[PDB]
Amino acid sequence: HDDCQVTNPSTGHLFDLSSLSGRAGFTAAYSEKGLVYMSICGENENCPPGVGACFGQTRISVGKANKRLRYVDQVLQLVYKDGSPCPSKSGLSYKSVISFVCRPENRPMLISLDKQTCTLFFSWHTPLACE
Numbered sequence: 001h002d003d004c005q006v007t008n009p010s011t012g013h014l015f016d017l018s019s020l021s022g023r024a025g026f027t028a029a030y031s032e033k034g035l036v037y038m039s040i041c042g043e044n045e046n047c048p049p050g051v052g053a054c055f056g057q058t059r060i061s062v063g064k065a066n067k068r069l070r071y072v073d074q075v076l077q078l079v080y081k082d083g084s085p086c087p088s089k090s091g092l093s094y095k096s097v098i099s100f101v102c103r104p105e106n107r108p109m110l111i112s113l114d115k116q117t118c119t120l121f122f123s124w125h126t127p128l129a130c131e
């Protein structure tokens with residue numbers, strides 16, 4: 001239903017990330033000194049309009065925001081696609097994959113940047129991802 005909510009279809013458990021939404025959003029550490037700004041289920045006020053995540057140093061987009069929350073194998077996931085053109089001979093764009101995993105007891109982390117696909121992979125351990 002693409003409103004920052006999703007159910008586990010096997011159990012009907014309703015997951016909801018609306019409590020993390022807001023333009024102020026969050027940041028994740030990037031490299032030595034940089035960061036990435038990110039808003040959940042909406043654009044981030046530090047990024048260009050419509051952009052849900054962007055590099056701190058440049059405000060260059062690594063994904064357009066959306067509310068299409070998905071459930072797969074106990075993980076909740078947002079995928080912000082259509083980022084800026086990345087350094088790529090074949091014309092790829094940056095995208096951000098944001099994975100919420102259960103923590104029964106709340107900052108995103110960048111765990112990987114796959115240069116092959118220009119995809120930034122983030123993880124966020126949160127009680128919001130538990131059932």
Ligand SMILES: [Br-]
Pocket residue numbers: 030034035036055056057058
């Ligand atoms: Br940066």
Ligand SMILES: [Br-]
Pocket residue numbers: 041042043065066067
């Ligand atoms: Br949105």
Ligand SMILES: [Br-]
Pocket residue numbers: 081082083093094095
């Ligand atoms: Br894309």
Ligand SMILES: [Br-]
Pocket residue numbers: 111123
């Ligand atoms: Br992790």
